[PDB]
Design a protein around this ligand. Structure first.
Ligand SMILES: Nc1ncnc2c1ncn2[C@H]1C[C@H](O)[C@@H](COP(=O)(O)OP(=O)(O)OP(=O)(O)O)O1
Ligand SMILES: [Ca+2]
Ligand SMILES: [Mn+2]
Length: 430
DNA sequence: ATTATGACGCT
DNA sequence: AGCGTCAT
C-alpha cells in the first residue's frame, strides 16, 4: 500500500534520431530528401549492405541488413548513399560528427547519457521541477505538446491519426491535477513539454528530426520512443503500464531481445511482459539469477532504477573490419597491411579525441576471428597503448596475435583471418 | 558474405 | 583479464 514504491521518482526521456544516417545524407544532398532512400556500405558484393532506410523506402519493405540489389527488387527507384571509404574500409566519421551536433544540443537542456550513435537518455527530473515553479500552477495547453502521444489514450467516449492524437492528449490534459507539484503524471507532462522544446531545437539547429519517449525510467522511455515514430514523441505514464504490458511481447523490452528473453518465455511458459507479475521475486531470481530476477520483478510493474549516467562521450574508440569468404587474410603481409590500415584510422581518431576531449587512451585491445569460428571474436588480447602512433600500434597488435598462426611456414597465415579489430580503451585525463 | 561499431556482465 | 551478451 503506502510503503509500496511505484518507481515514479524520476522523469527520464530517450531521444532517438529518425533513420539517422539517411537524414545525415539527405541534409548533405537535397536530391535525396523526401525519397525512398537507404545508406549502404561497400558495393561490389550484391550492391552493398544496407544499414539505414528512409521511411518512404520502408513502405516498400526495404530493411537494414538487406543487400542493395535485393532492396532494388522491392523498390526499383530506391536512392542510395554510400558510406565513405578510407584506407580500404568503411569510415563512419561523418555520422559520428553529426552525432556530436545532436548530443551537444541535448546537453544544453540536461545531463545526458550517450546510448548509441543516434540516441541519448535525459534525466529531466530537476528541469521539470524548475519549469513547474515558472508555471505557477498554470495549466498546460495542448499547444505546448504539438507532437506528443499519450499512450493508452483516447479510451472510451476519430478517423484520422492526428485527430486520434489530439483526442488522447485532450483526455490526458483534462484529467491533469496541476495543483500538485509532486504529481508524477504532471511531472511527466512537463517533461514532455521540455522534450518538445529539445526536439524543436535539434531540428532547428541541425536539420535532423527525431522521436522521443518520456516516462519514469530508461526502459519505459526507450519503449515509449518507438511507439510513434517518426518525428513524434510518446508519454508512457505509470498508469498506462498494465494495459501496455498485457500484450507486449517480452522481447520488445530492452535487454530481453536475446537468450535471456527467450529463456523467460520458455521456462515460465508466458509471452507478454505483464504475465511476469504472477511470479514472486524469489521465483524469478531462482530461474534468472539474483540481479535479473529482481530487475524483472520490478520491470514488469513499470519500475526500474538504472540511472541516467553522466556520459556524453564514448568510452572506447575502435576500428574493425571483416574479411568474409575468400577475402580472408592468408598471408602475413596481408595481416600486417590491414593492421596498419586500422591503426592509421585509429590514430587519426585518437589524436582528434585527445585535442577535443582532454583525455588519452592507455590500453590497446586487439581482437581477431579465424575462419570457421562463428563467434564474433575468436581471440582478444590487450597491450599497452603508450603513443598515438599507427606503425607502433600495428606492430604491437601483430606481436600479441602472431602466435595465432598455426601455419608452420613463415609467410603464410592459417587459418585465415576473417576479422581484425583494434580498440583504444582505459582513458585518463590529459 | 547481416558490417562496424560500443556498453556492460561473468568468472 | 578474456569471454559472452545485447544493443544500434
Ligand atoms: N546493425 C547495424 N549495423 C551498422 N549500423 C547500424 C546498425 N544498426 C544501426 N546502425 C546505424 C545506422 C542507423 O541509422 C543508426 C541508428 O540506428 P537505429 O536507431 O536503430 O535506426 P535508424 O535511426 O536508422 O531508424 P529509426 O528511425 O527506426 O530509429 O545506427
Ligand atoms: Ca534512430
Ligand atoms: Mn537508435
Amino acid at each position: 500500500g503506502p510503503h509500496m514504491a511505484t518507481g515514479q521518482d524520476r522523469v527520464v526521456a530517450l531521444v532517438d534520431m529518425d533513420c539517422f544516417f539517411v537524414q545525415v545524407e539527405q541534409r548533405q544532398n537535397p536530391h535525396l530528401r523526401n525519397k525512398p532512400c537507404a545508406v549502404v556500405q561497400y558495393k561490389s558484393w550484391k550492391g552493398g549492405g544496407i544499414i539505414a532506410v528512409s521511411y518512404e523506402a520502408r513502405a516498400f519493405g526495404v530493411t537494414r541488413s538487406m543487400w542493395a540489389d535485393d532492396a532494388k527488387k522491392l523498390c526499383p527507384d530506391l536512392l542510395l548513399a554510400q558510406v565513405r571509404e578510407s584506407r580500404g574500409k568503411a569510415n563512419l566519421t561523418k555520422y559520428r560528427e553529426a552525432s556530436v551536433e545532436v548530443m551537444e544540443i541535448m546537453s544544453r537542456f540536461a545531463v545526458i547519457e550517450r546510448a548509441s550513435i543516434d540516441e541519448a537518455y535525459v534525466d529531466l527530473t530537476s528541469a521539470v521541477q524548475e519549469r513547474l515553479q515558472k508555471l505557477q500552477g498554470q495549466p498546460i495547453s495542448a499547444d505546448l505538446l504539438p507532437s506528443t502521444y499519450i499512450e493508452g489514450l483516447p479510451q472510451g467516449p476519430t478517423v484520422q491519426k492526428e485527430g486520434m492524437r489530439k483526442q488522447g492528449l485532450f483526455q490526458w490534459l483534462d484529467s491533469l491535477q496541476i495543483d500538485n507539484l509532486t504529481s508524477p503524471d504532471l511531472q511527466l507532462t512537463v517533461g514532455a513539454v521540455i522534450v518538445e522544446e529539445m526536439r524543436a531545437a535539434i531540428e532547428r539547429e541541425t536539420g535532423f528530426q527525431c522521436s522521443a519517449g518520456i516516462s519514469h525510467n530508461k526502459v519505459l522511455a526507450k519503449l515509449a520512443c518507438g511507439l510513434n515514430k517518426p518525428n513524434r514523441q510518446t508519454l508512457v505514464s505509470h498508469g498506462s503500464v498494465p494495459q501496455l504490458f498485457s500484450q507486449m511481447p517480452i522481447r520488445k523490452i530492452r535487454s530481453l531481445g536475446g537468450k535471456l528473453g527467450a529463456s523467460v518465455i520458455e521456462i515460465l511458459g508466458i509471452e507478454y511482459m505483464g504475465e511476469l507479475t504472477q511470479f514472486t521475486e524469489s521465483q524469478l531470481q531462482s530461474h534468472f539469477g539474483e540481479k535479473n530476477g529482481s530487475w524483472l520483478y520490478a520491470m514488469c510493474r513499470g519500475i526500474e532504477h538504472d540511472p541516467v549516467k553522466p556520459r556524453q562521450l564514448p568510452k572506447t574508440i575502435g576500428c574493425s573490419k571483416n574479411f568474409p569468404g575468400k577475402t580472408a587474410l592468408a598471408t602475413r603481409e596481408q595481416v600486417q597491411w590491414w593492421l596498419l590500415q586500422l591503426a592509421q584510422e585509429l590514430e587519426e581518431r585518437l589524436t582528434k579525441d585527445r585535442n577535443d576531449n582532454d583525455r588519452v587512451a592507455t590500453q590497446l585491445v586487439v581482437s581477431i576471428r579465424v575462419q570457421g569460428d562463428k563467434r564474433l571474436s575468436s581471440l582478444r588480447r590487450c597491450c599497452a597503448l603508450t603513443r598515438y602512433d599507427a606503425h607502433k600500434m600495428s606492430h604491437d597488435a601483430f606481436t600479441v596475435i602472431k602466435n595465432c598462426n598455426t601455419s608452420g611456414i613463415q609467410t603464410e597465415w592459417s587459418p585465415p583471418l576473417t576479422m581484425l579489430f583494434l580498440c583504444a580503451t582505459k582513458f585518463s585525463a590529459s
